[PDB]
């Protein structure tokens, strides 16, 4: 058994990502933590927080070593400008993108067994003149990925999104048998080859309230959702639904599921966040590599202060680690 | 003080409403429970359930008296045909609607402090040639209500819906300033006049994920929601601007708010359903009187069997009582 390596991108320097990473470093880890970021950034922030940090260099041509408490391994990318916690900085936009580009490739190459990302600020990135829609779009394109799927998981509750950040008004047309087949395939595949579930049991939400109540609140379940499930169920895939989302989200139903397929953003996330502030993880399915992320944003306001909550990041790390195990 | 009267309509005689009312009658009550139903119907169901029941006649020309355990007060209405649990009898559709009419007028004329409804079967009512768009629409109409707002509550969380049963594709255009202005007005009005919450605190969801995230993920928050909210804030209403639905159901917000206002069905009820077990209550806002209701169907299958579950009915009644006492 060879010790594995994982790359972490704290993301937005002015954000709380660097803080959270310093806290992560305060413990033992079965894998080596290769943090792609500015050393000075990590050093100062650590200092402000009052937490000891010791960076050791990324040595690719050497056996990997589990990261020991108070330490992290470094894969440097330099800040384009100095950093003051709490205040953004347009140019650091290229820095954030740099570390994201370096980490992705590392996983595309094979240097790292997984990528766990910290919160980034899109705005600042775009203002710096860089085309950026979010991590899930960045890693998707840079990997030449046919299509991915987003998931937010806690422990026993995993929710997948057929469509993501689309205005409410454009959802209906977006859900087509084409979208659904690609989607469920990647979901079912990954629940098996990543989460290690032999026979994944997916619950499926209907597009409409009450799953369209057949005759009344919509025909999308009759025209595209049901036919596709009828196909995949016949292929031995276990798919329960379309079910009204406000019936499906009960333990009587959940305690017998491996995951939930929500048709859109607000149909599945509200219950998840409610279910776990800390513990949630966003996992990108479909990517040519294991990638998880936190469930929160940059929280500039709390940066450098000394109060964080690495709960999500830690969870995203642990899960990234388990997936390694189930994918090795 | 004086004892308050509430009126309860068990509803469809063949369903669980009657079993439920008998069950709720096994404990003491701070108010007189005037049940608008058939005497023999309640007594038979109580005997089949092995539960004691002693009816005393409703007598308006007398002081109300807190209901004693094992008893109920009765506002008689003759069934049209005998009743057999689990079997719909169309001639009895007139009985059901007659109890709704009687309880309704009772509330409208000051006889009763509130109305608490058990499940009703629309199918059998229409089958008897009786127009019935719905249980809550019936009261909406009999009381010349300009408009009603549906709320789902759990004695811990209150969720109002700007729009209910509509195909997902129709919500976007359905949310006009006109609709939103009114819905909020009634919500705010009733939290104050029916819940007794002087100066109510309301959290409003945005229509799109991330509440629009500027104008790059939905233009409605800018086009109609925020404009309507600012105006309403001028009126002195404490409205907490369009928030992302996925992060609104966090304790930091909920614990310091009196109600949430979702733009649509699946955006607000799933959390409510998840955090509710069965204690979900249906509250109809905008009527000239207080009205609470169970969050379930008639369950003909369970009728008479003895294994109902009075969770919803007890909450509905306890909530209606809390509302009464909190507004005397
Ligand atoms: Zn999102
Ligand atoms: Zn509904």
Curated annotation (Swiss-Prot), chains A, B:
GO cellular component: cytoplasm
Source organism phylogeny: Bacteria, Pseudomonadati, Pseudomonadota, Gammaproteobacteria, Enterobacterales
Pathway where it operates: Cofactor biosynthesis; pyridoxine 5'-phosphate biosynthesis; pyridoxine 5'-phosphate from D-erythrose 4-phosphate: step 4/5
The organism of origin for this protein: Escherichia coli (strain K12)
Cofactor binding: number and manner: Binds 1 divalent metal cation per subunit. Can use ions such as Zn(2+), Mg(2+) or Co(2+).
Family matches, as HAMAP family: PdxA
MF-aspect GO terms: 4-hydroxythreonine-4-phosphate dehydrogenase activity; cobalt ion binding; identical protein binding; magnesium ion binding; NAD binding; protein homodimerization activity; zinc ion binding
Quaternary structure and interacting proteins, as annotated: Homodimer.
Something else known: The active site is located at the dimer interface. According to PubMed:15026039, PdxA may catalyze both oxidation and decarboxylation reactions that directly lead to AHAP.
Function comment: Catalyzes the NAD(P)-dependent oxidation of 4-(phosphooxy)-L-threonine (HTP) into 2-amino-3-oxo-4-(phosphooxy)butyric acid which spontaneously decarboxylates to form 3-amino-2-oxopropyl phosphate (AHAP).
Binding site for substrate: 135-136, 273, 282, 291
Subcellular location(s) per record: Cytoplasm
Binding-site positions, a divalent metal cation: 165, 210, 265
Superkingdom per UniProt: Bacteria
Stated name of the protein: 4-hydroxythreonine-4-phosphate dehydrogenase
A GO biological process held by the record: pyridoxal phosphate biosynthetic process
Keywords linked to the UniProt accession: Cobalt, Cytoplasm, Magnesium, Metal-binding, NAD, NADP, Oxidoreductase, Pyridoxine biosynthesis, Zinc
Similarity section: Belongs to the PdxA family.
Cofactors (names): Zn(2+); Mg(2+); Co(2+)
UniProt KW NAD keyword: yes
SUPFAM superfamilies associated with the record: Isocitrate/Isopropylmalate dehydrogenase-like
InterPro entries linked to this entry: PdxA, PdxA_fam
Catalytic reaction equation(s): 4-(phosphooxy)-L-threonine + NAD(+) = 3-amino-2-oxopropyl phosphate + CO2 + NADH
Documented EC number(s): 1.1.1.262
């Amino acid at each position: 058994v060879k010790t594995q390596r994982v790359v972490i991108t704290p993301g937005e320097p002015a954000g709380i990502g660097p803080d959270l990473v310093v806290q992560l470093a305060q413990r033992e880890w079965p894998v080596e933590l290769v943090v792609c970021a500015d050393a000075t950034l990590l050093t100062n922030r650590a200092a402000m927080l009052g937490l000891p940090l010791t960076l050791r260099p990324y040595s690719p041509n050497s056996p990997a070593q589990p990261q020991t408490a108070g330490t992290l391994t470094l894969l440097p990318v330099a800040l384009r400008a100095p950093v003051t916690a709490g205040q953004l900085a347009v140019e650091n936009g290229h820095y954030v993108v740099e570390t994201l580009a370096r980490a992705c490739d590392g996983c595309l190459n094979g240097e790292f067994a997984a990528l766990i990302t910290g919160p980034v600020h899109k705005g600042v990135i775009n203002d710096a003149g860089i085309p950026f829609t979010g991590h899930t779009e960045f890693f998707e394109e840079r990997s030449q990925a046919k299509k991915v799927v987003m998931m937010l998981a806690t422990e026993e509750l995993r929710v997948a999104l057929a469509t993501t950040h689309l205005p409410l008004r454009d959802i209906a047309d977006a859900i087509t048998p084409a979208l659904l087949h690609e989607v469920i395939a990647i979901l079912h595949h990954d629940l098996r080859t990543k989460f290690g579930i032999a026979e994944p049991r997916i619950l499926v939400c209907g597009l409409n309230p009450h799953a369209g109540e057949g005759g009344h609140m919509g025909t999308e379940e009759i025209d595209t959702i049901i036919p596709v499930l009828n196909e995949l169920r016949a292929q031995g895939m276990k798919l329960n639904g379309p079910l009204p989302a406000d019936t499906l989200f009960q333990p009587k139903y959940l305690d017998n599921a491996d995951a939930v397929l929500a048709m859109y953003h607000d149909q599945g996330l509200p219950v998840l966040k409610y279910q776990g502030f800390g513990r949630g993880v966003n996992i990108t399915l479909g990517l040519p590599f294991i990638r998880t992320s936190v469930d929160h944003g940059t929280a500039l306001e709390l940066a450098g202060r000394g109060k964080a909550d690495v709960g999500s990041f830690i969870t995203a790390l642990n899960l990234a680690i388990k997936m390694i195990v189930n994918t090795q």
